[PDB]
Design a protein around this nucleic acid. Sequence first.
DNA 1: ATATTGTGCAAAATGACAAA
RNA 2: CUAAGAGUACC
DNA 3: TTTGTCATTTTGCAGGTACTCTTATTCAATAT
Lengths: 112, 10, 171, 97, 87, 654, 267, 166, 107
Amino acid sequence: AGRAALYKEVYNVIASDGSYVNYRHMALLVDVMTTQGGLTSVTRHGFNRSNTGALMRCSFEETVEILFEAGASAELDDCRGVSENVILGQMAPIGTGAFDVMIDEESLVKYM
Amino acid sequence: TXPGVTXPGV
Amino acid sequence: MFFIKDLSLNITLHPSFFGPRMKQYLKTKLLEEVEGSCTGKFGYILCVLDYDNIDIQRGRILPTDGSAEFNVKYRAVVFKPFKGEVVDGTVVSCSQHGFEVQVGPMKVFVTKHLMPQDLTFNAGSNPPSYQSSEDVITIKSRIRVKIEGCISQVSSIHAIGSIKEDYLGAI
Amino acid sequence: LRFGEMERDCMIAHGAASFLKERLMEASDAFRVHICGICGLMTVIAKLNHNQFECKGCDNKIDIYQIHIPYAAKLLFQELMAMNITPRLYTDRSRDF
Amino acid sequence: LKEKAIPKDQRATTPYMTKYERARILGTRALQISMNAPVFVDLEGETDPLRIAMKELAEKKIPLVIRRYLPDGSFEDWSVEELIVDL
Amino acid sequence: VGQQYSSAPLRTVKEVQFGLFSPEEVRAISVAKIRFPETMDETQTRAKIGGLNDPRLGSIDRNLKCQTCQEGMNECPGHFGHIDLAKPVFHVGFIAKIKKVCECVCMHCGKLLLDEHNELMRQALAIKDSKKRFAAIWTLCKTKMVCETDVPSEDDPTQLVSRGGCGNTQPTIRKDGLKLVGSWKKDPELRVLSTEEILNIFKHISVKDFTSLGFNEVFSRPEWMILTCLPVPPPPVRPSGEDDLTFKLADILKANISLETLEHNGAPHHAIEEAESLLQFHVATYMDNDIAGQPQALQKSGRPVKSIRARLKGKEGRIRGNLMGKRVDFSARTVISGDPNLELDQVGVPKSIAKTLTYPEVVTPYNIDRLTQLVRNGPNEHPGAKYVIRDSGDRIDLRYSKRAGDIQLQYGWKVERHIMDNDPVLFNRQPSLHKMSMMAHRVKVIPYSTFRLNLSVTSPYNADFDGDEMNLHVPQSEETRAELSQLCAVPLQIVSPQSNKPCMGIVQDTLCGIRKLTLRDTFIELDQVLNMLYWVPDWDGVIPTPAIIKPKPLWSGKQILSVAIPNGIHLQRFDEGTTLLSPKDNGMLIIDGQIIFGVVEKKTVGSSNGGLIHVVTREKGPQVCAKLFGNIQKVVNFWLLHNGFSTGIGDTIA
Amino acid sequence: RLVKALEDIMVHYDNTTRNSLGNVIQFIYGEDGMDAAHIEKQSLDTIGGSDAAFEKRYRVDLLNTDHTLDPSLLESGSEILGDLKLQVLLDEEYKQLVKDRKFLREVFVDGEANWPLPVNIRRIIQNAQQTFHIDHTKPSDLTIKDIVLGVKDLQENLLVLRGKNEIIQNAQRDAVTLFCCLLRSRLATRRVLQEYRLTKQAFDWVLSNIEAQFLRSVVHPGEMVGVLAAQSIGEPATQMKVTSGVPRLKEILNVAKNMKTPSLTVY
Amino acid sequence: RRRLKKVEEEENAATLQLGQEFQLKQINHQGEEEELIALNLSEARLVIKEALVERRRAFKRSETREKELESIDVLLEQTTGGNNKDLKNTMQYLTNFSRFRDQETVGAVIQLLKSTGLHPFEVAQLGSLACDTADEAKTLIPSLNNKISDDELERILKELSNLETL
Amino acid sequence: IFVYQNNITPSAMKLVPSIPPATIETFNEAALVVNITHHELVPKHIRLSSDEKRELLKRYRLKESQLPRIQRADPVALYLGLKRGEVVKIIRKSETSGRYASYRICM
DNA sequence: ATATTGTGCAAAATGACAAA
RNA sequence: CUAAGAGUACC
DNA sequence: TTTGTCATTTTGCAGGTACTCTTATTCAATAT
Ligand SMILES: [Mg+2]
Ligand SMILES: [Zn+2]
Ligand SMILES: [Zn+2]
Ligand SMILES: [Zn+2]
């Protein structure tokens, strides 16, 4: 019910001035905010306090404190986030990167 | 707040 | 000693090489690269078993490069010397410090400090050898050596052998 | 021109991961750095012409990898190291997803 | 890696090629054509690597497979031949 | 030349493991021990051995190689040194954490206060994540002020079970400045907790105890939070006029030498304590100059010292200023101007910008001829080539190389040439709030100093021509080029996911002209009809029968506009009060690409759901919709040019 | 802030919406698995109107005469009357339509009929009418069994989730229920034979294009829906008794215990 | 584990610490676990000969010591190319110190040692070391000390020397 | 289930966890005057069995933490007597699709 | 004669009081 | 160079 | 004795790009 009320509030904000946004965008926002069992602020004391990877947490707010805490707790960053691969300069697992392209020897022979 | 208009808090 | 072990090698193929003979190119490049090589992790890699169908798998294209990375998994015969391992060989050369014995594909240097005092270097005899009061060690002679120390050298694994222990020498 | 954060976000929305990588690495800063698979630190002496790679401390010479990272990433990692924090970069998964 | 690979008979993902998959296949094939890969389709005189790859995809002569990664690390191998380019 | 070939295997970073440097790891990785605060020797022309700019850490001059790796400044990553601290100092970022950890651990025996015997301690230790475990352990063990050598028995609170406790009194620990003060309960007695004793008690924490505090046995042990060796970053981190970090490291070395001399020569404890506090302060301000309460470390010029934390944090720090967002090559920026004659997916690029921005085309047997011609043209005219990249990495500049004669191109080389027509280019207007504000266009090289784009596409960009500047990015690989053309293309962005309706539409002069042209009064004579028909590029070539044949052949505006509308499009919108007859000519009925009735206005050709743009892009495809944009704009702009529209003061007069 | 919060949300190949940790945000994207660009506003005709209008629009009786159909509407109009098997098919079709009416009234309390749904059935009907040149006077070639079975098979053919277990099949049915309600509202026996007057090939072509367009509207795995949603929320805010606009958006994103205008609504 | 720098016991064959990657059981390329089979000089020589003749046949389709040396030299030059100085040396070593001749002898040896059921390293070392006295072999291989009885090792060496051909 | 008028003394709260597997749930009457599951903002909550939870984790390839979380203090969780690790199916009347099924794991 | 040093707020936390 | 400051352009 | 429970104190800064210009490097007493 909190998620439903949150969606209604966000929809009222967007649709107060006559604008229209598709349901899925606001639904994704409110589902992200309520996926932890409570209302997670888009502020640093909510979404950045999630163990989602030190590197992508530091890019938002309190960068150096996040690095220090990660070093103290010896956190493992599995490089699944977009910001991690951005920082490391490699193809993110997004869009064109959400899969691997591989060469088939049998198909290559089969064509000729 | 914010900043601006941290938080609150921090 | 001789074992057969599971190994994997990553091979990078240029895009120009994906002709209908890609399997043959990969098999060719696996040879001439790992056949008869020397690594510290597995010793000497001499030959590859089951060449008829080497597991080449699919092969992943490197992003923004175009080359393909194949993880070829193969069975390779290896000869890894071990500490305190008795192995036969044949002598190939002698010197003041000791003599070298051909064990498999490698040379093991047994030092004159590791030979009994009666077994003494002799340069008057041609070729120079090591002669004792009861037996003589000459070039191209069979002898067992016990390796007790292997220093990890990637270019060529070097091992320290001895014949000091009981029943170590010519059979 | 500054390829800012929210331009990167627009490219992420477009799903063009390779274009984003090309913008961040080939266009701006591409740096090949050598690390070792024992410790993820970049403390790997790489005499490329002599083909000698050596990480002192780990005392390894045959467990060295090269990674393409931005020079800003290398500078950040080295500043973290100067600040007594170890950003060990590993090229394999120790935990399943 | 055997457990990782979902068997072909029980792939539960869409048989249609995504826009991202099509873009990456076209880019990969165009880059390979630019670096002198063999061409499996007859050329009508065109020289652009991108449209060469487009012609190759039109009659399904691209010898690539998509390794679609499930979130758990499992993957499905979909050959470009059996994928449907609807868009 | 970039970076030469390295035999090391090329991988990608799968995992990043964090932690703290053990002092022995710092000593093992460091290639030099820094002892002299001076950066340059007495000759004032070389870097002093053992100074903060040791050649072993990296060459400060392009002329000489790094003494450790024997590589140039381009290759040398920079190798760390180490300063051997005379007395341990607190790491400024971990002091609070240290204050927590020492408040969880007995200050004498080095064991955690509340073991598993306490009731809430099974709950605290059963927490999965490290941070929450540490928070719970701390918020329960901070209130316990005695080591409790004997605890109540788990079976029953009748007999007492003895654990490995010593029974000493745990003090109350607060932080003053950069140090910790402990007040032992009066058997209060206040004294400063020395860093040496805190390090000793952190080294005595059992593996099980500090692994329950979130610390890792291999990567982050609590005693590594106390600095006994400082890693000196290489000169690349602090390039030269010395850097702020170089001066801070010199200050740390000076304080270290002072403390060493004071301890060696013997001194009152006051001087020793003052020197220790100075060394601690210099280390802390080197790592964090924004410590709350304490005065900042002022640089030589009276300004605050740029700490490492300052270098990282903020908008302009490393993360947000050089990693998340960075300055990129192959980008242009200039003023935008309108062009009704350009296609929706087309953008006008000035000829000079095209001459500057270059794309590398791989030398292939298919395009050897045109690449050879572009290399012949050179960089001084468009089209042309600016560079030739050899397979060895060597680069031939077309300038200064015309003396040597024609360059024989080889397959596999790259011709870095001026961007030509129909090249996909990313086109942006900042701030660029949404994804439609950054779209892929086709180059059209034009001879004037402004970018030229279609009027419709200005709506998603939120761009006017009142001095607005826009940005152009050139993809440098076939993969980026292809995914840009197949994912970010302007026709593919016509329908916005934001409101599941088109984002581009007919705007400005074209909208008013289309309203004026589709009025029932608008009748077009044969000559103007022929001109308007010819302006539609995909016109089938058959002249429509006039709406009126006698006494004079006249075509209505709807009849000529319907030529642009693709065949097979049905649209039926009923405005307020409209009927199947349209007395007011409102609403809209289009049957098979012919406008049966309705004045074409914003609700039909604008960015609206159910309008002509949405229907055409959903029925015939994005390319046909973009072609519709172009054709409608061309015909309506021609008709409005030859009809005229104005506005005046008399329009405001009732 | 919004972009940073949602930057790692992505649609995966099992159609679940997950972040970088692999946590499931939505088990199917947008609760329907459809790309936003392939959504158009369409009218659900079962929810609106009256009971009499609903019966007249949908109910067909082969035995009585109150809701009978003109035998000239279709070819075998004189042989179907009095039939029992086809009557059973009509009975289940109308029962399904009544169930859909009740379901749609339950979902939307205000009875709003125009909602964004993926595939525009009206445009497909109009294109088929124009492509096959319906003369609207000749009796229809369709058989009622063809209409009912074709609608059922088309519903079975609308696949969002391709799994082969009970959980995935149930999720697929839940994901396509609203579109299926729209499809049954549009492609009903009375409407197909009387209002639209399809032919056999026209009806089959309509079914094929509905299937193709629905399969084309499905969200593509790899879509970065988090960033899309963040931008689609932030950008309208740039155009912006109870607080609204930017202050209320910040009070919503910054979850603040005390807000400017706390109002409570009692019915 | 991923310990920064490695601490481990020094490898020693006498203490049966052959290495973490020389354990009794290894995961094959099929994903399951199989015992690490160790090949003595004769069995390894036959395995190498089988692999080489198979490679020679694939390339085509796509005993006295001196004659064996000539044959192995010709075959090595045929199926393989350069960078086989180590391979030539080890093939010559196997040809010289070949304890058994053909498939029958080595097959009988391997099945008899399978009935023996001892460590693969130890059984292959025994097949490589043509020892005479059983206590002599116990002294030669400390991994056999206090593991196998004196008389049984003596007798199995007797059958091995009975199967010893040329 | 213990239903009380005003409050439970904290000296009595500590002994609420009795010998397992018995679980004692305390509810205030004031909080139970109005049923919360009949609100239209409240969707349908159905407790999953262990077999159903296993099937759900197998089919979606999920770990425990990857499921959406529901607190073990949420009024609906207290209402249905959720225990940690138990998954509730949520039936929601969505507007893009008529019916949407979510799954929330107790924490 | 030149270098060297003298404007908009809720989290946390934390001592000085009551409940047992 | 670098740092700082000021004044602008379009949002 | 604790064991939470209620009144003082302790933090941490401001969107996106982009242009130009101007000023400035601790001042001065003192030993070598
Ligand atoms: Mg403007
Ligand atoms: Zn290392
Ligand atoms: Zn160097
Ligand atoms: Zn103690």
